Amino acid sequence: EDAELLVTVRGGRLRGIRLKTPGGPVSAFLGIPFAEPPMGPRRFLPPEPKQPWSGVVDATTFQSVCYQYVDTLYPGFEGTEMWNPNRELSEDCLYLNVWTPYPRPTSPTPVLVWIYGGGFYSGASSLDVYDGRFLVQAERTVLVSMNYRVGAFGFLALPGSREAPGNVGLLDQRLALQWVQENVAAFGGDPTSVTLFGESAGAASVGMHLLSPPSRGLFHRAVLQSGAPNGPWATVGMGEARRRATQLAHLVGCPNDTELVACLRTRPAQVLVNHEWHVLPQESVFRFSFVPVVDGDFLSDTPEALINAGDFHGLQVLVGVVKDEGSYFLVYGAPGFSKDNESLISRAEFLAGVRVGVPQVSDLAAEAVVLHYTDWLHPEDPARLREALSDVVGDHNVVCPVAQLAGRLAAQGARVYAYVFEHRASTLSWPLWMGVPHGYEIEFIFGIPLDPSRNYTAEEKIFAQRLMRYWANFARTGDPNEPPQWPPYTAGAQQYVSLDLRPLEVRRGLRAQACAFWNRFLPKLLSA
Template sequence: MIIPFVLIFISLLEGTYARSFVTVSTTSGSLQGVKQDGGRFAQPPIGLLRWAPPLPFFSNTTQNATAVGPACVQQFAFATASLIEPLFNNPLNPPAEDEDCLFLNVWAPTRSSDASSKPVVFWIYGGSLAFGTGSLPEYDGTSIASNQGIVVVSFNYRTNVFGFPGAPELLIQENNLGFLDQELALEWVRLNIRQFGGDPEKITIMGQSAGGFSVSGLVVRHPIDPPFRAAISFSGASPDNTPSLTPFDSFNNFSTTVGCTEAPGPARLACLRTVSAVDIRAYTNGPLSGSFEPLIDNITTFADNLERIRSGNAARVPLLAGSMQDDGTLFTVGETNLTAFLISEAVTLISAEANETSVIADSFRDLSFLCPTSLWTQAFVQSGISHVYRYDYGAVFSDFQAFPNAGAWHSTELPEFFGTFNASTATPDQVTLSKTFQTAIANFIKNPNRSPAPNWPEYVPGNNTQTLARLAYNNNVEIGNFVQAVTSDSQDAPCAVWNTFLDF
């Protein structure tokens, strides 16, 4: 079943939190929703539909959309779970998990005398394609919808072994199920968002980390008539991909460990479909599990992303993309052995004087986030696309320092954008920056063909231009000063090394 939910803003604006109901007519039937609840966007991917492409549901009956759906089954890698799970799984009230998880959420601003349809942002969460959910409180769309007049959509997609199994039993084009979930959710939005006051011709896809990689995938696989008009990538751009030499190892090891010892084929798949989701989660979150990643299928995922963009074989839409000043600190907590981490030639390009811990963190940032973003924005400009905006985010707040030397670490821009920061611990600068950053990104969503903020120029690569927007450095948090345009390639010196691995 496809059942979205509606967030009622009129009760918020009138100062009451009563459970006001609304009914919206969609291709999935008449949907009755209430404030802060949600429903399905696809049939439950369980039983015979486990490891199957998502199936849409069409109906003309009334559907109950008054209960928030659970997250998909999560995988937190055993070695890092003690750090990562508390940071990204709402530790005081972690979401319920279930294999039946394909739910979609809509926050729509109150209808006004202005009858025009509103721009739409389609939010894709991160989590290394292993964990994450659109229902986290951090991703609540209330502030954006009510303050910016934008329809906000979030949803769940399958991750880890459920979403990217790498199973030899499946057709190659049916292995990247999480990406197929994303496509179906986007198609549902195109069909139904007018009923929520949104304009299907004004959809911006936006994601962070693995969500940013997902945005990259959508851009590359929709070169003709893309189902969106703009793209935003926070700390996530997919460079060229190297095919795995052992694409089925993790799935084969998983199969054997959970007791399905048949040779790869229909019998083994049938056995695996009888294993409970609870037992599968116990394996994937245990010490023996491998990682489950997308396969290059030349349908949802390609090896030559950058060349496709440069040659015009990708969605030709405005792009806003960037990374964090300290994107690497989270992923290198406890790493102190520089020799074991990277080759010495790269170190000298990063910093000859920095301590080993900071060099390790910076190197991870450069290889995984900064240099891919540099390559993507360059490729867009080289292909002749106008309205490309690149940023580097540098805001550091004391209540975000969740581990030593965290800095402006990976994902700390999100509470600022969504307006979901902790109001009891936030400084005045933090409150101001949230309004500023949200407004700038909303400006791009509303009109991606003009600068999102004062002094933010379109990106032009090179050392003779100043078009890289440093955001919120030096406590500059007002809309008039939070952008500092600096030399366009001033951050990219380490990419001389890393690009040999990223751009084939």
């Protein structure tokens, strides 16, 4: 037997598994329980810590995925299936994963913690694109990732109630971060140098840990990829959380908060999932039913407020976006879009698609969106309208939320590095018109191109290794630069770098013109 694959944590003993990468072996401990299964009367409640166990927990395989909707948009299409659960669904899903070099480091190694995205309704640590083995080998960090509850199980909120307080998925994350503090050294990780990194709802989560004091003590650096806590989709007010929870009850046959939540616990998990999307208040895309709630507890105020008021001296942050943030979301409900044609929409479809991409704004607000995003020299050109609506959805939801976060963090004392990821993966199966879509940088960050049994080019394997160097550099020193230079982003110079097969190129302004509209002007309009 191998003693590098045997580890004792506070709760008990663990057997890991040796994993093979093209560059060497890696120790993996998959499926370590870190909470009491949130089942039956624990559904919707905050997570209890895992009671200790006797015997040796088997940690050689990924564990269950938390209950979530499964995407049926293009059944069997790799572009959608690569995100769908690849383990059984269960409510007994609160496990985490640790990947470490082989043999286990004998001296403290920096730790990266991966929080996955999925709009807070989906996701799992077991997806192929989140495979830790290549980063761990190439860059000799410790990598942790965890499963957190999603959909109604993680974020259904009857605010003020004791039976469904909201944000328990976030608390799941916090407990994994606490677990890392007490146990990561048993694997060679240094609990005093922990970097969070996430994408989409995972970047939004990272950001919510920045703005929540009880979590801020649990990590030291943050990477936010294509997401931010101040996005219009990442949080919901108390009022609307209660409406959405209440309508979910009605849709599954349920009727006083106590009595309501009681009835919900008796339903099969799948039953709640089936009605998830029907509690959205209008036809939308990039909007999700059960998301974090601003209730004064986990967030004492809105993330936009806590950002504008924070002191971020001592913080290093790496933030960035893909080149075509919006394009992917359009094939989920914008009129005239499909992955199977050119989606050369008409002006009437563009106008229709604008109310779908920007839901619950006034007609005056939507008008202003159409003003800024029409080329009035070419007001009905189909290719121009397709790209324009893509820019609407991507700017409103990702790029300008991110650009505001960066600018306020920088002008308040944090050191910020900003990127735009401009490489379309040669293996990408979505049509060419989607450009570089939401999510398709993750594979390069995790170094999946180095997997020989996949079809990436030689120049892409090198790109991948550059990216894993930047990230791991940032994790070790709060600076991606290997000591052309990657400058910090400031509110004035607004400098960022392009990431692609070409060397680093420095630019200015994350869509600075468009983001004045969404960040400066549009709030003032909604206030009158």
